Amino acid sequence: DCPAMCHCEGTTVDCTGRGLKEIPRDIPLHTTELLLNDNELGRISSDGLFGRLPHLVKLELKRNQLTGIEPNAFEGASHIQELQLGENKIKEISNKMFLGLHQLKTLNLYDNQISCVMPGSFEHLNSLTSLNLASNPFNCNCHLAWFAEWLRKKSLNGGAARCGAPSKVRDVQIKDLPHSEFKCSSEGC
Secondary structure (H helix, E strand, C coil), X not given: CCCCCCEEECCEEECCCCCCCCCCCCCCCCCCEEECCCCCCCCECCCCCHHHCXXXXXXXXXXXXXXXXXXXXXXXXXXXCEEECCCCCCCEECCCCCCCCCCCCEEECCCCCCCEECCCCCCCCCCCCEEECCCCCECCCHHHHHHHHHHHHHCCXXXXXXXXXXXXXXXXXXXXXXXXXXXXXXXXC
């Protein structure tokens, strides 16, 4: 068995470029890699499929026009270790969005539209060692002051994250700015 419109290499399931609007409900119990690249998904639903595939370690949802993830969608999915979310349309990052992924080591948010990050959004991720945040228009004001000091703390590749709003600090590395310059004046999320 293998989802009708996908391809199955070993424990790898490839449903890339199949024009999917929602993730196939019948994914084998032993899938290790799930590739849903180049589809038309829209947003991750909270039905708990992920927390139900105990062997899923890598999940790819690149180029899917994603503009959000329903709350508690990765609950029970402590197995996942790699999440490819590059090239989507996410603008905000909630704190009940990555809840459950405390074993995740890699998160790619490259080239999305993230401009603000809610406090406590990445704390649920104990194991993170790689965070790709390049090509994201971060709004560096009073609202993201907490986040700046969070990157320089956890200590990572920095995420390659840069400011894309405060004209002055534009194109500058979030981590390269003291929370003292992170001031809004005359929003966030």
